[PDB]
Amino acid sequence: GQIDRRETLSFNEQETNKSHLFVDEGLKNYVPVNHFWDQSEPRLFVCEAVQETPRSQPQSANGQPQDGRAGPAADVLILSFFISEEHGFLLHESFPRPATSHSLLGMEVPYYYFTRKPEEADR
Amino acid sequence: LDGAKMVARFFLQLGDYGSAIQFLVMSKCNNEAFTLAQQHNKMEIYADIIGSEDTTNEDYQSIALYFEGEKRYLQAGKFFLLCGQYSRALKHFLKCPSSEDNVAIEMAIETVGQAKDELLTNQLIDHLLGENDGMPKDAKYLFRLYMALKQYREAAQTAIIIAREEQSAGNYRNAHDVLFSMYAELKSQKIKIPSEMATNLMILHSYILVKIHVKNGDHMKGARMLIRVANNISKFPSHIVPILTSTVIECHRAGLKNSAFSFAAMLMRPEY
């Protein structure tokens, strides 16, 4: 959840400035996979992040679905940001990718764009 | 780590390899240090810098295996000794050619002294007593091995042998200096001094003090030291009549005329 900053206009491999402005401990298990900017708003940005599984998988004592043992969270998160020289990175939104949606395709206001399942369009 | 690499790059541009090598500990780039210290033959400086918390016996071993690959058996021996591989260290010290044999024997003595192993000890004693090469070595090395093993009474007996030889030769200062280096050690430890060693050293130092007192014009202390040396004249077989003649003269100068007369009556014997 950290933001680093580094400088190399002159040749450098620098130490980070560190800011702790991100409070959301829910992101620790997510990895970004797709990203986009608004075609009209240069301050506005979005990223799709997947919840990656460890290399080999355990099981529970009871016959539950293996990590779906508990209540819901996002298969994949969509995070949107306002980015500025005066205020840094501000989380504009966080939401689950819709259950009818297979990936983030883009963004241009008023809309994020997603790829729909042909499993559901015929219903 | 990376700010420290810039400081390394700056000293590499200035050409100070000694300062540049520290950053291979401080920025943890240890294998570039090993190879740089190898290329400039500064391997002891790298091994001393390696005294930091970042490091391992596998560093001293990788250094030892490098010198073993160079067939530098003395240096390989030294880094196996620092790694704690006493059998390999001794086997390398014993495999040294005869041009390094003194330093290799001193380090083999140190290796056996640190190891305390009876097989390695007997292997080195068999080497010092020549049963592997058809020659014993100077008694100074058996003495130094007994000291390295802390066999201090056996070392003391060997020091008395080396001293009695030097007394017979008239080298009273060398016999003194050997017995003294052993007496001081036996006194620094909690160990029995031989009554012969104490008696001999005392007698030898009394003879050295004759020169000091007679030079300083103290005919009394000079004469009284000469009286003790003369009461033990058999320990000075190379200087008997000079010592007794000096004893008479200094006793007469001191007003010890009965002592002067007793050593004059001794000098009047047909043997002197």
mmCIF file of all heavy atoms in Angstrom, chain B residues 12 25 30 40 51 82 87 90 93-94 97 101 114 140 148-149 151 159 176-177 185 194 202 206 222 228 231 238:
data_model
loop_
_atom_site.group_PDB
_atom_site.id
_atom_site.type_symbol
_atom_site.label_atom_id
_atom_site.label_comp_id
_atom_site.label_asym_id
_atom_site.label_seq_id
_atom_site.Cartn_x
_atom_site.Cartn_y
_atom_site.Cartn_z
ATOM 1 N N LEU B 12 36.588 3.742 -7.130
ATOM 2 C CA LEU B 12 37.071 3.021 -8.312
ATOM 3 C C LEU B 12 37.587 3.987 -9.396
ATOM 4 O O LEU B 12 38.624 3.720 -10.002
ATOM 5 C CB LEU B 12 35.959 2.099 -8.858
ATOM 6 C CG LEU B 12 35.664 0.859 -7.992
ATOM 7 C CD1 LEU B 12 34.404 0.156 -8.494
ATOM 8 C CD2 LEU B 12 36.814 -0.149 -8.027
ATOM 9 N N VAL B 25 31.310 -5.349 1.322
ATOM 10 C CA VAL B 25 30.562 -5.602 2.570
ATOM 11 C C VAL B 25 29.354 -4.665 2.682
ATOM 12 O O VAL B 25 28.227 -5.134 2.797
ATOM 13 C CB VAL B 25 31.490 -5.540 3.809
ATOM 14 C CG1 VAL B 25 30.794 -5.168 5.126
ATOM 15 C CG2 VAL B 25 32.149 -6.910 4.002
ATOM 16 N N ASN B 30 29.542 -9.059 -2.076
ATOM 17 C CA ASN B 30 30.728 -9.758 -1.548
ATOM 18 C C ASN B 30 31.561 -10.530 -2.591
ATOM 19 O O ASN B 30 32.779 -10.621 -2.433
ATOM 20 C CB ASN B 30 30.288 -10.733 -0.438
ATOM 21 C CG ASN B 30 29.877 -10.049 0.851
ATOM 22 O OD1 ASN B 30 30.689 -9.469 1.551
ATOM 23 N ND2 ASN B 30 28.619 -10.103 1.220
ATOM 24 N N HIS B 40 43.981 -8.122 -7.348
ATOM 25 C CA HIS B 40 45.038 -7.275 -6.771
ATOM 26 C C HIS B 40 45.861 -7.940 -5.644
ATOM 27 O O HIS B 40 46.680 -7.277 -5.009
ATOM 28 C CB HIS B 40 44.421 -5.931 -6.354
ATOM 29 C CG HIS B 40 43.866 -5.177 -7.537
ATOM 30 N ND1 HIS B 40 44.600 -4.584 -8.539
ATOM 31 C CD2 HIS B 40 42.549 -5.024 -7.870
ATOM 32 C CE1 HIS B 40 43.751 -4.075 -9.446
ATOM 33 N NE2 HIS B 40 42.481 -4.324 -9.084
ATOM 34 N N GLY B 51 35.253 -9.421 8.710
ATOM 35 C CA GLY B 51 34.895 -9.448 10.135
ATOM 36 C C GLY B 51 33.528 -8.833 10.508
ATOM 37 O O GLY B 51 33.146 -8.902 11.677
ATOM 38 N N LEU B 82 41.669 -20.359 9.402
ATOM 39 C CA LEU B 82 40.588 -19.408 9.713
ATOM 40 C C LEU B 82 39.184 -20.013 9.537
ATOM 41 O O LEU B 82 38.276 -19.700 10.306
ATOM 42 C CB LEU B 82 40.746 -18.145 8.846
ATOM 43 C CG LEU B 82 41.937 -17.266 9.279
ATOM 44 C CD1 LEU B 82 42.315 -16.297 8.163
ATOM 45 C CD2 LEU B 82 41.611 -16.448 10.527
ATOM 46 N N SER B 87 42.933 -30.300 9.900
ATOM 47 C CA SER B 87 43.576 -31.418 9.190
ATOM 48 C C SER B 87 44.065 -31.007 7.796
ATOM 49 O O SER B 87 45.236 -31.208 7.475
ATOM 50 C CB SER B 87 42.609 -32.605 9.105
ATOM 51 O OG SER B 87 41.405 -32.233 8.459
ATOM 52 N N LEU B 90 46.980 -28.398 8.287
ATOM 53 C CA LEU B 90 48.233 -29.085 8.601
ATOM 54 C C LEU B 90 48.783 -29.853 7.397
ATOM 55 O O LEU B 90 49.970 -29.747 7.114
ATOM 56 C CB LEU B 90 48.047 -30.029 9.794
ATOM 57 C CG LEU B 90 49.335 -30.783 10.186
ATOM 58 C CD1 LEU B 90 50.460 -29.826 10.581
ATOM 59 C CD2 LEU B 90 49.082 -31.691 11.380
ATOM 60 N N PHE B 93 50.352 -27.321 5.231
ATOM 61 C CA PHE B 93 51.617 -26.871 5.830
ATOM 62 C C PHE B 93 52.733 -27.930 5.722
ATOM 63 O O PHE B 93 53.862 -27.595 5.379
ATOM 64 C CB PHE B 93 51.417 -26.397 7.276
ATOM 65 C CG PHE B 93 50.576 -25.141 7.441
ATOM 66 C CD1 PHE B 93 49.474 -25.107 8.314
ATOM 67 C CD2 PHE B 93 50.899 -23.982 6.701
ATOM 68 C CE1 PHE B 93 48.675 -23.953 8.403
ATOM 69 C CE2 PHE B 93 50.106 -22.827 6.803
ATOM 70 C CZ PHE B 93 48.991 -22.813 7.653
ATOM 71 N N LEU B 94 52.429 -29.214 5.923
ATOM 72 C CA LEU B 94 53.384 -30.314 5.759
ATOM 73 C C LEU B 94 53.785 -30.563 4.297
ATOM 74 O O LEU B 94 54.923 -30.958 4.034
ATOM 75 C CB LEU B 94 52.793 -31.589 6.384
ATOM 76 C CG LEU B 94 52.646 -31.533 7.916
ATOM 77 C CD1 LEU B 94 51.982 -32.821 8.405
ATOM 78 C CD2 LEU B 94 53.993 -31.409 8.634
ATOM 79 N N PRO B 97 57.059 -26.856 0.215
ATOM 80 C CA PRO B 97 58.447 -27.088 -0.169
ATOM 81 C C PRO B 97 59.431 -26.459 0.834
ATOM 82 O O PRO B 97 59.079 -25.577 1.624
ATOM 83 C CB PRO B 97 58.580 -26.492 -1.574
ATOM 84 C CG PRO B 97 57.548 -25.368 -1.578
ATOM 85 C CD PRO B 97 56.426 -25.929 -0.712
ATOM 86 N N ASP B 101 59.777 -23.789 4.703
ATOM 87 C CA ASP B 101 59.650 -24.810 5.744
ATOM 88 C C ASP B 101 59.597 -24.222 7.162
ATOM 89 O O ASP B 101 58.806 -24.676 7.972
ATOM 90 C CB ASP B 101 60.823 -25.797 5.618
ATOM 91 C CG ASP B 101 60.479 -27.251 5.966
ATOM 92 O OD1 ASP B 101 59.289 -27.631 5.994
ATOM 93 O OD2 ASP B 101 61.431 -28.033 6.181
ATOM 94 N N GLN B 114 46.288 -24.968 17.986
ATOM 95 C CA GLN B 114 44.862 -24.636 17.962
ATOM 96 C C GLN B 114 43.964 -25.884 17.890
ATOM 97 O O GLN B 114 42.915 -25.920 18.531
ATOM 98 C CB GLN B 114 44.569 -23.741 16.753
ATOM 99 C CG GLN B 114 45.070 -22.295 16.898
ATOM 100 C CD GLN B 114 44.643 -21.429 15.712
ATOM 101 O OE1 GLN B 114 43.662 -21.686 15.028
ATOM 102 N NE2 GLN B 114 45.349 -20.359 15.427
ATOM 103 N N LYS B 140 64.512 -25.761 19.154
ATOM 104 C CA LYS B 140 63.603 -24.608 19.235
ATOM 105 C C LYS B 140 62.196 -24.934 18.721
ATOM 106 O O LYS B 140 61.230 -24.465 19.303
ATOM 107 C CB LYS B 140 64.208 -23.368 18.546
ATOM 108 C CG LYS B 140 64.040 -23.324 17.017
ATOM 109 C CD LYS B 140 64.762 -22.115 16.413
ATOM 110 C CE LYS B 140 64.599 -22.092 14.887
ATOM 111 N NZ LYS B 140 65.359 -20.971 14.278
ATOM 112 N N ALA B 148 53.085 -24.228 22.269
ATOM 113 C CA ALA B 148 51.814 -24.118 21.544
ATOM 114 C C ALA B 148 50.730 -25.084 22.067
ATOM 115 O O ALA B 148 49.553 -24.727 22.119
ATOM 116 C CB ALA B 148 52.088 -24.354 20.053
ATOM 117 N N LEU B 149 51.127 -26.284 22.500
ATOM 118 C CA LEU B 149 50.282 -27.275 23.184
ATOM 119 C C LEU B 149 50.040 -26.957 24.678
ATOM 120 O O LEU B 149 49.311 -27.690 25.343
ATOM 121 C CB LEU B 149 50.948 -28.658 23.037
ATOM 122 C CG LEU B 149 50.994 -29.213 21.605
ATOM 123 C CD1 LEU B 149 51.939 -30.409 21.560
ATOM 124 C CD2 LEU B 149 49.615 -29.668 21.128
ATOM 125 N N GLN B 151 52.145 -27.556 26.981
ATOM 126 C CA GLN B 151 52.986 -28.539 27.670
ATOM 127 C C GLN B 151 54.204 -27.829 28.296
ATOM 128 O O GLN B 151 55.355 -28.009 27.892
ATOM 129 C CB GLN B 151 53.354 -29.664 26.682
ATOM 130 C CG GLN B 151 52.114 -30.491 26.298
ATOM 131 C CD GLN B 151 52.389 -31.625 25.314
ATOM 132 O OE1 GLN B 151 53.485 -31.830 24.815
ATOM 133 N NE2 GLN B 151 51.389 -32.413 24.993
ATOM 134 N N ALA B 159 63.908 -25.824 27.168
ATOM 135 C CA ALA B 159 64.596 -24.552 27.382
ATOM 136 C C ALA B 159 65.890 -24.721 28.199
ATOM 137 O O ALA B 159 66.902 -24.115 27.858
ATOM 138 C CB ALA B 159 63.633 -23.575 28.066
ATOM 139 N N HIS B 176 70.785 -17.031 29.210
ATOM 140 C CA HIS B 176 69.958 -16.142 29.987
ATOM 141 C C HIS B 176 68.625 -15.830 29.284
ATOM 142 O O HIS B 176 67.575 -16.124 29.842
ATOM 143 C CB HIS B 176 70.752 -14.875 30.303
ATOM 144 C CG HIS B 176 69.909 -13.795 30.913
ATOM 145 N ND1 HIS B 176 69.088 -12.921 30.235
ATOM 146 C CD2 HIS B 176 69.779 -13.531 32.248
ATOM 147 C CE1 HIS B 176 68.473 -12.152 31.143
ATOM 148 N NE2 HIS B 176 68.871 -12.485 32.380
ATOM 149 N N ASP B 177 68.652 -15.294 28.061
ATOM 150 C CA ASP B 177 67.453 -14.857 27.335
ATOM 151 C C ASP B 177 66.450 -16.001 27.071
ATOM 152 O O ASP B 177 65.237 -15.815 27.213
ATOM 153 C CB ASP B 177 67.846 -14.108 26.045
ATOM 154 C CG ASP B 177 68.558 -12.761 26.291
ATOM 155 O OD1 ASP B 177 68.693 -12.343 27.466
ATOM 156 O OD2 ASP B 177 68.908 -12.083 25.300
ATOM 157 N N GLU B 185 57.128 -16.800 31.329
ATOM 158 C CA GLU B 185 55.894 -17.507 30.971
ATOM 159 C C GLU B 185 55.395 -18.394 32.123
ATOM 160 O O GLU B 185 54.243 -18.267 32.535
ATOM 161 C CB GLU B 185 56.107 -18.317 29.685
ATOM 162 C CG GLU B 185 54.858 -19.069 29.199
ATOM 163 C CD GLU B 185 53.671 -18.172 28.800
ATOM 164 O OE1 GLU B 185 53.868 -16.958 28.579
ATOM 165 O OE2 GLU B 185 52.542 -18.701 28.659
ATOM 166 N N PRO B 194 61.204 -24.946 37.407
ATOM 167 C CA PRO B 194 62.253 -25.888 37.800
ATOM 168 C C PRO B 194 63.322 -25.219 38.671
ATOM 169 O O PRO B 194 63.824 -24.148 38.326
ATOM 170 C CB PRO B 194 62.833 -26.454 36.500
ATOM 171 C CG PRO B 194 61.705 -26.242 35.496
ATOM 172 C CD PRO B 194 61.056 -24.943 35.959
ATOM 173 N N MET B 202 69.267 -17.101 37.625
ATOM 174 C CA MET B 202 69.781 -16.326 38.749
ATOM 175 C C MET B 202 71.301 -16.177 38.679
ATOM 176 O O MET B 202 71.826 -15.061 38.715
ATOM 177 C CB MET B 202 69.327 -17.098 39.997
ATOM 178 C CG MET B 202 69.886 -16.673 41.340
ATOM 179 S SD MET B 202 69.519 -17.913 42.620
ATOM 180 C CE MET B 202 70.948 -19.009 42.444
ATOM 181 N N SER B 206 73.284 -12.790 37.549
ATOM 182 C CA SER B 206 74.325 -12.310 38.476
ATOM 183 C C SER B 206 75.605 -11.954 37.723
ATOM 184 O O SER B 206 76.135 -10.866 37.911
ATOM 185 C CB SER B 206 74.673 -13.347 39.553
ATOM 186 O OG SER B 206 73.528 -13.767 40.272
ATOM 187 N N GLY B 222 79.372 -5.512 42.465
ATOM 188 C CA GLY B 222 80.173 -6.266 41.493
ATOM 189 C C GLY B 222 80.928 -7.445 42.120
ATOM 190 O O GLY B 222 80.808 -8.573 41.646
ATOM 191 N N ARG B 228 79.154 -14.928 44.197
ATOM 192 C CA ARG B 228 78.128 -15.931 43.860
ATOM 193 C C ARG B 228 78.469 -16.687 42.585
ATOM 194 O O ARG B 228 78.344 -17.912 42.549
ATOM 195 C CB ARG B 228 76.756 -15.279 43.722
ATOM 196 C CG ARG B 228 75.680 -16.372 43.537
ATOM 197 C CD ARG B 228 74.319 -15.770 43.247
ATOM 198 N NE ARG B 228 73.986 -14.798 44.295
ATOM 199 C CZ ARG B 228 73.516 -13.588 44.132
ATOM 200 N NH1 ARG B 228 73.217 -13.079 42.983
ATOM 201 N NH2 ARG B 228 73.294 -12.859 45.170
ATOM 202 N N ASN B 231 81.264 -19.073 43.479
ATOM 203 C CA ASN B 231 80.702 -20.218 44.212
ATOM 204 C C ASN B 231 79.947 -21.210 43.298
ATOM 205 O O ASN B 231 79.592 -22.300 43.740
ATOM 206 C CB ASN B 231 79.791 -19.703 45.343
ATOM 207 C CG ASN B 231 80.527 -18.985 46.462
ATOM 208 O OD1 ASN B 231 81.728 -19.109 46.643
ATOM 209 N ND2 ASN B 231 79.817 -18.241 47.276
ATOM 210 N N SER B 238 83.624 -21.907 30.084
ATOM 211 C CA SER B 238 84.407 -21.140 29.109
ATOM 212 C C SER B 238 85.146 -19.906 29.689
ATOM 213 O O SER B 238 86.024 -19.380 29.008
ATOM 214 C CB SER B 238 83.525 -20.768 27.902
ATOM 215 O OG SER B 238 83.291 -21.901 27.076
#
